[PDB]
Amino acid sequence: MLNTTFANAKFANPFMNASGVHCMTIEDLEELKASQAGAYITKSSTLEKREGNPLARYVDLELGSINSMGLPNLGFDYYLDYVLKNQKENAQEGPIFFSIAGMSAAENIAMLKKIQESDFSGITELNLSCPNVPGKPQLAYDFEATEKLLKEVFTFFTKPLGVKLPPYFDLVHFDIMAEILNQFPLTYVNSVNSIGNGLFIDPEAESVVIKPKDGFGGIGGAYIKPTALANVRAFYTRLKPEIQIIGTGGIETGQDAFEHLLCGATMLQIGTALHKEGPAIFDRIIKELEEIMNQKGYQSIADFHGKLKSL
Amino acid sequence: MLNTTFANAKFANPFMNASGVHCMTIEDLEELKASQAGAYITKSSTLEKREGNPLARYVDLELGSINSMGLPNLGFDYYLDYVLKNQKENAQEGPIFFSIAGMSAAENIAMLKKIQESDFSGITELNLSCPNVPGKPQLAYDFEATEKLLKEVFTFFTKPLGVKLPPYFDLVHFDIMAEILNQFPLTYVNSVNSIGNGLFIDPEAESVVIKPKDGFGGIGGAYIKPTALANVRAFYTRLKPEIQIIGTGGIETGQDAFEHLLCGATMLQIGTALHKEGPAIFDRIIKELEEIMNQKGYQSIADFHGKLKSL
Ligand SMILES: Cc1cc2nc3c(=O)[nH]c(=O)nc-3n(C[C@H](O)[C@H](O)[C@H](O)COP(=O)(O)O)c2cc1C
Ligand SMILES: Cc1cc2nc3c(=O)[nH]c(=O)nc-3n(C[C@H](O)[C@H](O)[C@H](O)COP(=O)(O)O)c2cc1C
Ligand SMILES: O=C(O)c1cc(=O)[nH]c(=O)[nH]1
Numbered sequence: 033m034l035n036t037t038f039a040n041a042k043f044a045n046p047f048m049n050a051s052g053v054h055c056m057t058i059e060d061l062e063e064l065k066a067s068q069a070g071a072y073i074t075k076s077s078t079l080e081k082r083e084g085n086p087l088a089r090y091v092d093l094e095l096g097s098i099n100s101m102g103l104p105n106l107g108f109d110y111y112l113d114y115v116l117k118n119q120k121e122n123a124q125e126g127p128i129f130f131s132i133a134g135m136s137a138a139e140n141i142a143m144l145k146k147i148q149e150s151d152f153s154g155i156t157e158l159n160l161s162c163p164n165v166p167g168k169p170q171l172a173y174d175f176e177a178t179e180k181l182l183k184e185v186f187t188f189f190t191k192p193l194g195v196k197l198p199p200y201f202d203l204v205h206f207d208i209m210a211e212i213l214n215q216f217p218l219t220y221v222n223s224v225n226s227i228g229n230g231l232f233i234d235p236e237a238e239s240v241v242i243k244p245k246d247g248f249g250g251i252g253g254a255y256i257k258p259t260a261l262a263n264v265r266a267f268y269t270r271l272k273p274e275i276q277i278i279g280t281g282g283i284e285t286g287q288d289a290f291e292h293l294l295c296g297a298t299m300l301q302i303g304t305a306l307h308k309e310g311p312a313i314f315d316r317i318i319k320e321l322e323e324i325m326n327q328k329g330y331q332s333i334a335d336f337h338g339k340l341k342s343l
Numbered sequence: 344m345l346n347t348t349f350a351n352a353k354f355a356n357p358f359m360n361a362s363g364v365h366c367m368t369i370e371d372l373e374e375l376k377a378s379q380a381g382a383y384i385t386k387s388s389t390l391e392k393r394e395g396n397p398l399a400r401y402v403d404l405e406l407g408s409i410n411s412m413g414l415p416n417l418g419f420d421y422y423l424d425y426v427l428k429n430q431k432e433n434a435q436e437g438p439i440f441f442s443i444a445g446m447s448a449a450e451n452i453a454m455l456k457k458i459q460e461s462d463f464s465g466i467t468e469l470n471l472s473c474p475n476v477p478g479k480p481q482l483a484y485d486f487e488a489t490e491k492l493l494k495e496v497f498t499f500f501t502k503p504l505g506v507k508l509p510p511y512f513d514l515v516h517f518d519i520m521a522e523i524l525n526q527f528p529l530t531y532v533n534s535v536n537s538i539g540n541g542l543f544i545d546p547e548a549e550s551v552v553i554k555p556k557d558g559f560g561g562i563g564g565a566y567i568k569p570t571a572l573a574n575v576r577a578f579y580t581r582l583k584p585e586i587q588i589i590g591t592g593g594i595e596t597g598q599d600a601f602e603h604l605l606c607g608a609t610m611l612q613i614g615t616a617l618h619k620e621g622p623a624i625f626d627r628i629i630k631e632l633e634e635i636m637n638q639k640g641y642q643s644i645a646d647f648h649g650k651l652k653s654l
């Protein structure tokens with residue numbers, strides 16, 4: 033019942049990991065491949081391998097998570113070599129998704145050229161929102177710099193490309209961004225990365241709980257669902273239908289997933305809850321969603337996709 | 344133990360209602376005066392009375408609230424006449440706070456000129472984040488327009504003035520705004536208004552839960568505490584010490600208040616939790632904070648104010 037078409041490919045169900053979670057090593061990626069996820073995405077990579085930030089850099093909270101990982105990753109070539117070899121042995125009803133988060137515009141262009149030049153036939157996700165690098169305004173909060181980068185990208189990049197966006201909080205920003213993105217042949221937008229630079233405090237110790245950046249980190253989980261649904265819905269009513277949506281933020285239960293799909297998401301990614309539970313989450317949440325659909329008489333996601341009702 | 348000095352005035356404790364909650368009529372305001380709040384603030388006003396948005400416009404949520412009130416208020420002259428008459432009968436160890444939220448730059452200047460010309464001797468709060476008017480980018484997300492307005496204001500306004508800001512999510516935005524505000528003789532900044540334009544869905548009805556704006560509204564409560572603490576802390580390490588801070592966002596318990604004061608807030612405001620519980624919240628949360636302080640050996644807020652430790 034959760035069969036999905038996205039970016040002209042067929043998936044068994046819309047669920048994926050969110051970039052950054054369970055997707056750093058080839059071993060992690062093979063575990064996602066073995067799970068019941070519909071599709072999976074690599075850790076956002078940079079040209080050089082990176083150790084990332086000092087530890088403690090991820091903390092589980094009652095209502096979600098806070099992190100400032102610092103883009104720890106094994107480097108672009110490691111992920112590219114893995115996906116290229118995994119295309120060479122044909123199996124996943126499913127392109128692999130490949131996230132990049134260069135430390136500059138130049139680095140993102142350089143990685144996109146290598147992807148474009150390679151045989152990669154999967155789907156690439158450009159991270160415009162990589163939030164826990166110290167010293168850089170999220171690129172997707174600078175509308176002019178975003179537009180300039182995308183213009184340069186689409187002078188050469190003809191393979192399927194989505195962008196990973198930070199949350200926006202003002203309807204006029206949704207208007208401005210949809211006007212920028214609508215001029216390109218983008219495959220998708222992925223809404224939302226972490227809510228940026230929140231703070232969690234241990235009141236007993238009177239201190240922050242993560243080490244980097246004086247304790248400020250991206251917030252995920254149940255704290256952010258209201259903003260994530262809003263971002264998915266607000267782009268769903270504004271983007272051209274050529275650009276589809278991946279919804280990420282606060283997905284733990286089948287009900288949370290239902291809600292993103294009702295707003296207009298086509299694939300769904302799970303971050304915080306997958307961190308906590310491990311890839312057994314995918315079997316649990318697919319069953320929760322199917323049970324919701326069965327109670328409502330729904331046999332396919334097209335029965336309620338995008339059909340959130342106003343009052 | 345909770346005696347506080349702020350804006351050169353003395354208050355019995357730092358707690359207040361947040362603007363918008365329990366502060367629309369004279370009767371509401373007299374109930375906050377009667378309660379144990381240390382101080383209180385009026386509903387944001389406009390020059391003309393406004394009925395505000397269609398109903399359902401406020402909803403209680405398990406983790407906070409969503410609202411799109413539309414700035415329902417009884418109009419500037421009604422609040423000004425009330426505070427002016429309440430200054431005339433001398434009592435509150437405590438200036439009243441007066442919030443304004445003009446529908447334009449002109450209306451805000453017009454109301455500020457009336458306050459400056461009146462005998463008002465309390466404190467004014469200029470709302471730069473009034474989020475549920477349909478058709479207007481939050482003014483405080485437009486740094487150029489914010490700076491231009493504040494420049495004009497401080498050509499004439501000599502009385503104690505604070506600004507109510509929306510949450511920021513990028514450390515560079517904290518830098519830009521602190522640079523703008525630090526050039527003025529502002530009394531305070533009040534961080535945070537709601538998280539803007541979030542969405543809450545009833546999955547059984549498959550619809551949004553508030554009427555105006557296709558169900559998008561400001562989010563308050565426990566959802567937003569990580570963001571509000573970050574915004575208080577980030578302005579506390581950047582603002583000149585002349586500009587003090589009011590923390591608002593997700594305060595329900597003594598521990599939540601403790602955390603905001605640890606970040607640097609001097610006064611605290613309670614929105615969602617006061618909506619739910621009514622003015623008896625002030626007695627409860629004062630006692631909770633006092634108990635935390637007693638357990639730590641603290642006899643005054645200065646023992647821990649702003650002393651949040653990094654790792
Ligand atoms: C541990 C961690 C690492 C993250 N790293 C990335 C990453 O490399 N790239 C990406 O685009 N987002 C990353 N994020 C953001 C997630 O992809 C997702 O957008 C965020 O956690 C919102 O989802 P959630 O509520 O399910 O956690 C990361 C999140 C987590 C918790
Ligand atoms: C019912 C509603 C009305 C609001 N109206 C205003 C108001 O007129 N002006 C103001 O500056 N903020 C208003 N806000 C925002 C609150 O002052 C406070 O910034 C927001 O609720 C965050 O606090 P909380 O987590 O304690 O709710 C209102 C909030 C509530 C829920
Ligand atoms: O690796 C990081 O810290 C990271 C990247 C990103 O895009 N989002 C986030 O929450 N963490």
Ligand SMILES: O=C(O)c1cc(=O)[nH]c(=O)[nH]1
Nearest residue numbers: 412413414473475537561
């Ligand atoms: O009146 C409104 O809707 C209101 C104004 C404000 O500044 N903040 C908010 O949450 N609601």
